[model samples]
Structure formats: structure tokens, C-alpha cells
Target: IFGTPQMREIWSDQNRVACYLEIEAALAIVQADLGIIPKNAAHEIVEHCRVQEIDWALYKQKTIGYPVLGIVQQLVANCKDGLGEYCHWGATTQDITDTATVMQIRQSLTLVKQRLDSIVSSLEHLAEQHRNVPMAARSNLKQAVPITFGFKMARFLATFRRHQQRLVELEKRVYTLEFGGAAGNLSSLGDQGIATHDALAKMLDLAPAEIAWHTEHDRFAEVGTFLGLLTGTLAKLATDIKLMSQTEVGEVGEPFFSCVYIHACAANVRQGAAALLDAMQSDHERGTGPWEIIWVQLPLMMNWTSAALNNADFVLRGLQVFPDAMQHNLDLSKGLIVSEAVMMGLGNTLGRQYAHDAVYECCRTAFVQDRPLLDVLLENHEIASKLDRTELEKLCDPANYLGQCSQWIDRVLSRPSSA
Candidate 1:
């Protein structure tokens, strides 16, 4: 349910530090080019901002008030004498910090998109290869009718593609840089402020935000929401895999012997209920809010750790998903295809409610009796007059119910580049 190493690497500490350095260097170059500082000083500042020279521990202690405070001090230390003042000329702490954070997030988003692309590729291959792999479609752990495994894959592909598009759109908003000095006002640098800001953004290869984002934390909120959406998508895939792998269902399973890590369980707990509960509590504590907890959780969760090792890990793994179990469960709940059948038949003749009622009655009986819904519906008096056996069978077929799923995937894949 989590991403691979490639995803993990995007948000690594080294990378974060590198981005901060890059931002500082970019700002220096901008100031130099604009005649705000000596060109030699800018070059010297860039060379001095190297990660090797600074004592991270000392910097960390000094920057207690804000994360970028350390970097600022380090940059100043690099510049000899008077030039140090010119290093962060016309910029506030938030300008560099927010921009660097956004840069890291943008890079991470690319990784997320790539991960999803892999998932979509797998699903597409499954849809094509298993287009006719016959399996039972279930609802509430009861078989309703026959369906092809490909159709199920197609549905996954379609849903995931939508999320992919959403992520791309989010990147536009997420990648913009925040500039301006104290109190969201660029007054510190006087007339050189706006030009210096724009120049710095260009040098950093980041889009310039219209104004400072000190109090307007919508960018952070937006990025958080996007990550939340990504977690939701991953969870859906995991849920389906877990279901498909269930013993009673046994229709599908996740890739096995793949360095699997299961969430810890508690005594008397059925399945991973305890792990899930713990995950929920972790989210409630650290998730977006005024009292939000901060720790190294995002990249770890995206990296696919089964469970958090401590409070830090708990915060990092935003959500837990058991993909193997999800697939197994999806396979067992056979009623997935019934709604389509009901909609097709009832929508035209009996209206949506009437059609839903007929399917609902059959599903209810099948659940209690542990029988197939199609079989029950074939003999049920409520639907006998409304739909003949041939029609009912066609409706129950899962392949027929995947209305436009394949088309939707194709459409998303073919769209023009969002960037």
C-alpha cells in the first residue's frame, strides 16, 4: 500500500538540505546579477553554503525558533565580513524556508506521480491480460454474479487516473514560491524588493507567488490535502487487495514474499483492527490542525513502512494499508456487479429505486443464505416479471457492468501535459 524506495529517496534529509542550499545560492546569484551585491561575494557565498562546512548540530541549536534560521546563520558564517549581510539581502526567513519546502514537496509530488504511474501500468496490464478472467463479484462477502478480473482492474485504473490528474493540478499550486520579508511586507529591502524576489525565483526555477505567504498558509493546506488524497488512493488499492486475499474469497492476492511487513496485532482482535485503531489515533493527534504534531511521518508512510516504530514513525506513516488483504476482500464481496445490472434494467423500466429494490432484496437473501444473488434473483417473485432470465444474466455479468471504465482510463492518459 506504500511506495517503493524511489519514493522514499525524494524526501530524504540530504535532499532537503540540498534544496535549501540551492535556494540560498539562487537568491545570492539573483542579488549579485541585479547589482545589489558584489558578484564575487555571491560566488563566495555559494561556495561557502556547502553542506560539509557547517556543523549541523550547532546550526540546529541556533535555529530553534525556525528551521531556516540555521541555514541563514550558516550562510552568514560563510561570507567573510561585510558580504554576509548581503547574502540574504531583501529576504525574510519565510521566503527561503517556504520556497525550499515547496521545492521539496514538488519533487516529492513527482515521485508520488511516478509511483501512481507504476500502479496504473500494473492495473492496465491486468485489465488487458485478464479481460476475461472469470471470477465472482460479491457484495457484503456474498457472491452476486460472474465478472471478469480485467473489469475490476479497469475500475482501479480509472479511479487512480483521476487521482493522478488531481495530483498534477495540485503541483501547479504547490510549486509556487513564497517571498517577502517580516510580517508579509517586503519593506526591509526598500525599492529592490520585488525585483530581487522575482529574480531569486527565476534562479531557483520556481514559479513566483504573487505575495508573501506568512499567514496565508493555504499553500500548506493545499499540499496537505493533496497528500491526504494520495493516501486515500493508496488505501483503496490496499483495501481491495486485503479483501481479495481473504480465505473465504480466495479470488485474488497481493504479490507475495515481497519483504512484507504486517501491522502488529493485539490479543482478541480480529484481523488488523488494533493496528488500524492505532493508526487512526496517530492521525487524530498529528494530522492537520492547530495542535498538529510534527515529525518525520510523510515520507516514511509514502515509503510503505507497515507500522510506525514510535511516535515519530507513527506521525510519518500517515495511513496504513494492507493491499494483499484488500484485494482478497474485494474478491469475496461478490455484490459489486449487481448495482450496474439493477441500474441498467431498472433505470429504463422501473426507475432507479425500483431496480435498486429488486437487487437489494436478492442481495439481502443471498447474504443470509450464503448463496449467489443471481441465483436468488432468478427465482425471486419481485424481479421475475421485470426482467427475464437472459436479461438478468446479462445484467449480472461483471464485464457488462464496467460501463466506460476502460474509456475513462484512456481519456485521462491521453490528456495534454498538465504542466
Candidate 2:
């Protein structure tokens, strides 16, 4: 329900196998360029790296503990006898394995970013189109103020915009080379390891680690946290859409297209948060049981992200904004929804505390007497004396009190990007 087959395939086991082989081929070619391995070996290894040539059934069952070697064996078998020996060249399984994972990270982030940008685009259109569109602003599920529908979309737009920035800035940190070689000292490659690492990084279009990250897992943790935050916002969007779709508060809705998944995102956000806390507390220099959390955290959060962005995107795209429905909902509570406007306006003469008490009674009387809040305010001696009936009427109109909504929406649209 939350994920797509295409996305799953992008991160699936076969995908892992493909990345591993690609890394092996990359490592071989780089080593060959540096004269560390035979050029023929690099060429042959590259040729056989395709999954169709792999003995998948054998590779899966061969390694009960870790299957890195099992897959490499198939590639080696496909290469010429002398060439196959140099296939992996100066790298250990961890080097190939982690590098492959980083490649996958690049793939995953790109897809998520694309969808995130799409969501951002759709929302920007909504915000710009509905800049002054008035709607009841609720607090505790009860109308307490007035706000433009555009203001709501712009609010989410700002968060997603920042998230897009975060993803862009994060590329180098997570999409990095992970070639450490056995104990990460490059015992096999000796003095040439650094050069080889740099070359391989160039080949893969990833940032060079410069040092081993085998035991260091913060990069993945950072990624998990980012995805968590992303899902968090997506879920918030979904929740608002769901809430807005309700029968009574029909100010907005998902329509034919897209809530507590927000709660799910909340859970995921906390999960990523707690995982990072563990990252801070865990021993960083070497192996720690806690680092295992990074591996599990991202996929979990990405799944949430996938579902959230997909669902929210579908819902928001199909969103049906009913201005009349919104105005009608605002009137259901009579003028009480604009009570704050009355109280604040009355505060000019009666003082804030006195005005609060005066408007508070007016609201209660309006409810008890089945009358408009504007009439009750006009009837109040203190309120009537403080301001004439026309003043009271303006204060009680929900649409009149949408202070700064259009201007603020203008501010959002004027942002450097997403305009």
C-alpha cells in the first residue's frame, strides 16, 4: 500500500547483486588503469557482470553468513581463467559491499527527491492560486481564527522546500566511496590504495571517503534521519488532508485522490531520532552493536517515505478545494469562529481582560439564545459602547479577519525557488 514495485526493485536483492558486480567491475578497471591488475581482467570482469550470466541460485545458498563471495564467484567463473583471478583486484568484500550500498543510496535519494519536488510543485500551485482563499483556522478541532487555504499550503511548502535543500546538501555526505580493504589499512594495495580509492570514486561519481567508514556508520544514520523528517512532513500533509475531508469540517479534502499516517511518520521520526541518539551514544571508532541500527532504519523510514509521499501526492493532486463549502463550514458556528477578532478589537477601549470577559459572555449568550454572535456583541452594553454596530459586524466576519494571509502567501511565492 505504501511502496511501489519499481522502488522495491531499485533496492531489492537483485539490485544489490547488480551493484556489487558493478562495484567489482569498477574496482577492477581502476586497478587495471593503475597497473595493479590486468586490463584483460578488467574487461572480462566487466563483460560478465551482467545478472543474466550469474548463477543466482548457487550464489544465494553458497554463503550462509554473508553472500558477498558467492556472487563474486559467479563473475569469476564467467571471466577467462587468468583474468578471473584479478576480478576483485585489491578489494575486500566489505569494500565492494559498502560501496554497492552507497550506490543504492544515491539511487534511493534521487527518486525520493523527484517525488518531493513534485509534491512541492503541486503545493506551490495550490498556494499561488488560492492566495487569498479564506478558510476557518481551527485550534483543537474548533474554529478559533481565520486563515487562507493558500497559507496552509505555503506552510507545508516551506517545510518541503527546506527538505529539498537538505537532500541536495546531503548528497556528498552519503553518496561516498567506501573502499577500506580488509582491515581498512589497505594492506593488499599498500601505498597505492589512496590513489585507487580516488580513481574509483571518480569512476562511480561518489565522494571519496579519504578514510575507512567500515566501523563508522554516521552517513547512513544521517540519511535515515533525513528520510524520517521527509516522511514526517508527508504524513503531516496526509493528516491535514484526511482531517479536512471530514463531513463537518469540509473546508478541504483529498477528493478522488488522498492521516494518522502522520502518526506513523511521527513514530518514524522518533525512531530515526532515537536511532541517532544511539549513534551519538554508541562507540564510534570501532564496531558497536548499535551501528546495526543504521542498516534497518533507512529502509524502514524510506518505506514510510514512499507510502507517505505517494499517498499524499495522489491525494493532493486530486484535491478539490471548495470555497463555498469552506465559507459554509465557517458559518456553522455562527460568528463565534471570529470571537478572537471581536475580543481583540474590543480590547482597544475596554482593556484586554475586560474585553475578553465581555466577548466570552457574548459567545455563551449567542450559543444559548440561538442567535448570531454579531447580534450578541451589538446587544452588549460594554461592547456596543466601545464600538458601534458596524464595527461589531466587521469583527465577527470570518473572511474579514484573515490578517496578512495574502501577504504571507506572497512571501512564500517570492522565495528564490518554487516561485
Candidate 3:
């Protein structure tokens, strides 16, 4: 119930099997056009490559040499007149398997990008809506200064927009085909190898690889890294909102639901990474073992990405921001929240260190005596004579102390959509 339908569909065995069938079918057409395999044989194999016909129970039984072998076995049986042998004529198992995985990644990325764009757009409007909604900004979990709620939201908006840029850049680096024969060399095909590879690449609609990636796992690792960082940022954003939603804070919250967003997103991050590391440890010449394990774990990794994106998107998109509550919480400190503003104003008369010491002493007295900081400062003969009541209260006003916060919100909101 807490999962994503988009992810479930993307990672389903049916989709994985369908991807395998697509690659095998495309490779058949490529080889037949190059005159490497008879057109009749390729036609039969391609026809039978449909996922609905494959006996998945039997396919799952062997568990050797990439499950594409299972499909190939069934494809050969479906062929007639001794023409069955040419189905995988010039290709290795990994060539079909890895290329199939890239296709799945391509589809999954498209889905993720859609959700991410929605999140970015949601936050953009949120930042604009709350641009001047005053609230207390915390550091070390305690109020440190006054800041507009819009200013806080704008920071998240910028982070998500930057992720938009990163996703575009990553597409170029990670979308290439994984096509190398067994042993990372196309020795079986002699001079026709490169030409046939390009033919298959064109058929598959994938970027042609400059070199075969028999052992190069960086493309996969890069994907894990991107999601890991994205989820980490999401967890942080959620934590900020979770804290602000507290009864004591009461600045923002969901309409009726929750998470540390940290614990949920963190566990996703860690589980998602375990799949990537062992996939990294596979051998170079031929690591069917690592490849097999990673393939099974691929859905798990994709599911985590889907869950984090969905959960974070839900929290932000439906979030309720209460300006009145924010203003109320900002007033709860009885002007002590603006101590820095008062100390800085006093700095004009006293030295900076001396002003800090005077404010510190008055702050202590106000807390101990259960009195407002304005009255405590009024009783300080050393400082009270320097300022009148109106000037003193103005310096302690939290709403007035939000220096340049609305302007900062403007700066962020003014950024272009692509920014």
C-alpha cells in the first residue's frame, strides 16, 4: 500500500521478460539484415520471442548463463527445419542481457523525471506563496534568527531545480548500450562485428557504445549515486518539515500524515546501495554470477528510488503552511528571539563584545525572573539610559528583525524554471 504502481510496473518480471524479448528480437533483425543469419531463421526466432509464450516456470528453473538462454532455448524450439541454431548467431548472453537492462533503465528514468518535475514545480509555487510569511529560523534545533517561511522553501526549490540539471547531464553519460561479446572481444564475428553492433544499436534506439563494457560497472554505480544523493537531500528536507510540524513549532505540516522522512528515506538509501556495490565486485572477463544477482536486485533498487521520490513528493506537494501559526510561534519567545537584533543595535553605543555581554546578562535575568526581555533590559541601569521604550521594543520585535529575508525569497523566486 505504501509502494508505487509506477515502480511496480517498471520492475515487474513481465517487463523484464519483455525487455529481454525486445533485445533478442532486435538482434535477430540486425543479424538477418547483415546476412549473418538466414532471414527465415531470424523471422521464426523473432516471432516466438513474445513474452506471453515463454514458460516462465521452466525458464526460472535452469538459472544459468543469463535467463535469456531460457528464451533462446524456447525460441530455437519454435524454429523449423534445423534453422534454430542461428538465433543467437554472433552474440554473447551479456550483450543481450545488459542491453536489455539499459532499455529498462531508460524507461524507469523517464518515469522518475516526470515525478521530479512535478516536485520542482510544486515547490516553486510554494516558495512564491510564502515569500513573506514570517517564521523563526532554527540552528542546533533552537531559534537562532527570524526568517520568512518563503525563504526556507526557496532553498529546497533551488536544490530540486539543480537536480533537474544533473538528471539531464547524467542521461548523456549513462544511456549508452552495453554490447560486447564474451571475453570482451568480438572474435567470433571476424570483420563484421562493429558493423553488426551498430546495426543492433540503431534497432534498439540506444546510444552506440564507444567500447564494450564487459566489466565496466560505472554506469550502474553512477545511477545508484544519483539516487542516493537525491534521497539524502529529500530526507533532510523532510526532517526540517517534521521538526517544524511539532506542536511547539507548528509552522507547517501535512494535512494528516507523517515520517521522520529521515528513517524511511535512509533505510531506502542503504538497501538501494547494497545492490550496487556487489554488482561492482563482479569479475571482468565474464561475471555471470554478479550479473545474475544484480539483475534480481535491480527491481529492489528501482523500487527504493520510486518510494523515496513518491514519499518526498507527497509530503511537499500536499503540505499545509500556516502563516498565522508561524507568526504565533515567532511571538512565543517574548522578544528574546530577537536578542541579536537588540545586541547589534546596542553595539552602536557599546563595543561589540561589551554589547554581547550586556545582552547575555539581561537574557539570563529575563529567563530567571519569568519576565519579558524588554522589561529586564529596562531595569539595567547601565543600558536602560541609552535607549527609550519605543526604541527598545522596536529592536526586540521578531517580525522587524527578518533583515533581507523577503528579498532573499524574491531572489530565489526570480530564478528561471530551468535554473
Candidate 4:
């Protein structure tokens, strides 16, 4: 679901540099509007804030303490003599870098939202298309009762839609500017600090935060949390696809083929089909087996290394997922649902404890004799006397028990993108 090029574009170096330029320009404009610098200088900075003019290697060497320092110095070098000083006027390094980071993150989120919408829409289409396609619902990898495949897809779609809304709302909280200069103080701009901050935010197309966010890294934490949530959702979808593509399930697969390649043959037959065959054979073995093994193992190793380098707790509890096994278990435990239904009906008539005991007996009998739960309950004279056969059948029907599942899907799908 997250394999789009646009998502990658957000993190590109050019984009990052562009964001830096935007922040610099906005700061200059705000400083000029506040009369902290000349208006012409602001215009000059904005016009000349091109990434190609900056000597990134030199900037990188000079601004070891802060990112924006390097870029600001480069901007100053490019500007005219007296006007160069006006480039960064009253702002600190954090003001430029933090605001730029927030802007980039917000823009990236917009793109991510688009991708998430596409995925949710795809799921909604699947739900609608397969709404009544019946499949055996399994618990513990054993058949329990029948369920429509549409309901299953709808559940995932509904969850994704809900998360998408959560992320959209989170943007208001996450996409905040950090103008706190040098120790969270507005002291650098003198009397015009607050005015300059507000104007800079407006110029940058960002909201004015109540206070500067310097040491308080909540926005970073919040965006990180959002990414974590997104990762969870994608992992879920990936897990589902992986399970469905398994030899046992055969339900779905990644769209790409393992054997396909674009540049397999050349124009000349100098290296003919024999060489091509050998290359293809080698490619298949490397691509499908050893390459995949290395790819998977390398990520795991790198993750561990990263955690160790960062002095993080290496238990990695956040990534524990077993969707296939979970689905299997859910299938095998179908009898539990039947037992619950029976218990509910019996409780209505025979008091909760008595109903529990009766249902327990039914379950025990079904388990021992390997018979249907409903059949066992039918033979129970006590249960038979308490509830009519038709009523019991109604309780046992899994389809009837899925209260408002279809309605929930419709409700989620009908909402707007931001919702």
C-alpha cells in the first residue's frame, strides 16, 4: 500500500533543501515586515535562495552544531554585502530548521493521506464487490461457521478509515512551528519577537503556535507516533496479504511477479538464449532464495544494530505480529462463539449461572463426542424445554450475530477524506 513514488519524494534531499530555503525566505520576509530588516533584502533573499548556489560540503563542515546555521551562512555568502546580514536578521538556527521540518512533515502527511485514501477506497470496493461471497470462518484453523468475505474486507476498511481520520486530526497538533530562539526565549527579536514570529508563520503558511516549542519535542514525538500508527496499519495489511498468499490460504498476493525483469535480453544475439537462460536461472535462484534471505536478514540486523547504537531496549515488542496464526486460532475457536450464543439465550430464561452450567455441559458433550454444538443442545431436554428450536437456531446463526457489521462499513466509507 505504501509503495508510491510520491511518498519517497517527501524525504528527498532536494525537497529538504527546498524546505530550508522556504523557511529562510519566510523568516526574512517576516523580519522585513517587522522593520527588523529592509524589505528589498527580504525580496533578494527569497529570489536568490536557490539550493544550487549553496556549497553544501562547506556548509556541512561549518554548521556542525546546527543545520540551519550552515544554510544561513551559505545564503549570506550569496547575498550583496550589506544585505547579507539581513538574511537571518533576528532568527536562530532552530527557528529556520524547525519551521522547515514542520512544513515538510505537513506536506508529506498530505501525500500520505492521499495514499491511505487510495488503500481505504480499494478495500471499500472489495467490501462492496464481495459483500455476500460466503467463506468458512475458521477458529484455531478449523471451520466454525460461514461468513461473507465482504464483511472481512469491510472490517479492515473501517479500521483504516478510522485511523486515517485520527492521522488527519493529528496534523493540527503535529504541524506546528517552533520559533523558540536559543533556549525557548523570544529575546532575540527584542520588542518585535512575538509580532515577527506570527508574521513569519503567516508567510510560511503555518499556524502560530501559542508558544515556541524548543526543548519540548512533543511535535516530533507526535509525528513519530503517527508514523508508528501508520506502520502498524501497513504491517497489518502486509501481514494479511502475506497470509493470503501463503500456500495454505491462496487468497491474495503482492502484484509483482518474482520472475519478471525488464532488461533480460540485448538487441544482438552475441549472448544468445543460452546465456539468457543461465542468467534467468541464476537470477531466479538469487532473487527468490538467497537474495530474499539476505534482504530480510539484513534489515533485522540493521534494526538491532540501530537499537544498540541508540542504547534502546532491544526486546522489539512493538513488531510482534502473527496474523495467519491469529486467524487460524479464531477459526478453531468457533465453538466458543456458539457456546456464547447459547449461554446468552439460556441466561435469558434459566438465570445466568444455570445457563452457564447448561452451556458448559453442551460444550463438554460436543467436545467429547465430536458432534455439532447445536445437535448437542437439541438433545438436552433442559435446554429444549427452556428455548424453542427456532430461537436456538437464530442464536446459533453467525450471520445474524454480526450486529451492524455492514452498517459500520457503510458509515465509514460514506464519510469525507478528512473525516
Tens-digit per-residue lDDT, 132-162, candidate 4: 5545465665666555666777777777777
lDDT of residue 271 for candidate 2: 80
C-alpha TM-scores of all predictions:
0.67, 0.89, 0.90, 0.65
Q: Is candidate 3 or candidate 4 better by TM-score?
A: 3
Candidate of highest TM-score: 3
lDDT for 234 (candidate 2):
75
* Backbone-clash count (model 3): 0
Query: How far is 248's C-alpha from truth in model 4 (Å)?
Result: 1.9
Tell me how far the alpha carbon of residue 328 in candidate 3 is from the true structure, in angstroms, after superposition: 2.7
Predicted candidate 1 versus true structure: per-residue lDDT over 299-350, tens digit per residue: 4443442121121122212322233443444345454445556566766766
Query: What is residue 112's positional error in candidate 4, in angstroms?
Result: 1.1
Between the candidate structures 1 and 2, which one is better when assessed by lDDT?
Answer: 2
In candidate 4, how many clashes are counted? 10
Q: List model 2 lDDT by residue over 281-397, tens digit each.
A: 555444535655655665566666676677677767778898998888778778988888888887868898989998998899999998999888778776676688877787788
lDDT of each: 0.59, 0.78, 0.78, 0.59
Model 4: runs farther than 4 Å from truth?
A: 1-4, 60-66, 140-142, 257-408, 411-419
lDDT of 1: 0.59
Higher lDDT: candidate 3 or 4? 3
Cα RMSD to the true fold for all candidates = 9.3, 3.1, 2.8, 14.7
Off by over 4 Å in 3: 60-66, 80-84, 257-262, 349-354, 415-419
